[PDB]
Ligand binder design. Sequence first.
Ligand SMILES: OC[C@]12C[C@H](CN1c1ncnc3[nH]ccc13)C2
Length: 167
Amino acid sequence: VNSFSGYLKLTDNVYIKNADIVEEAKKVKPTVVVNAANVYLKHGGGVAGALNKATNNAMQVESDDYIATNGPLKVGGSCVLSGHNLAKHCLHVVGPNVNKGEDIQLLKSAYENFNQHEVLLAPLLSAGIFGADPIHSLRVCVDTVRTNVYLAVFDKNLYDKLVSSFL
Ligand SMILES: OC[C@]12C[C@H](CN1c1ncnc3[nH]ccc13)C2
């Protein structure tokens, strides 16, 4: 039993809700919140911009030190950093950004990072400003993640479409 509330159950381990991931994280304070990161951990917009703003830019400060030490992530890769005031940990995961021409096949690799964590609050990878089809992202999530994932979909209209079209 966990403290996630109001989610629709899609499969044995995947759950979904129309919610702002920032507000969800502040309420639940989950062990792991997933950020929709880029390889440079530059948290400018989308989910990443929103999470970073909620940390008063502490996420960006920590991220800049991480990059200075380790260099960029790989597309499809991840790193674990602090969750600051939002969660215990933030798993920064890089899905392919279609608006940059990156290979959508890497979306499965991106979701595989979730399997290293028993429970996660997460967005749909590569959706929104990353330019992929969110229905596809949800399908890859369900077919790749085996741990317990709580998906927050900010757009209510998109949420209804994802539920109604879910196979
Ligand atoms: O998960 C659906 C997605 C579409 C991309 C961005 N949307 C979000 N989902 C949850 N909290 C969010 N905050 C800002 C955007 C946002 C991922």
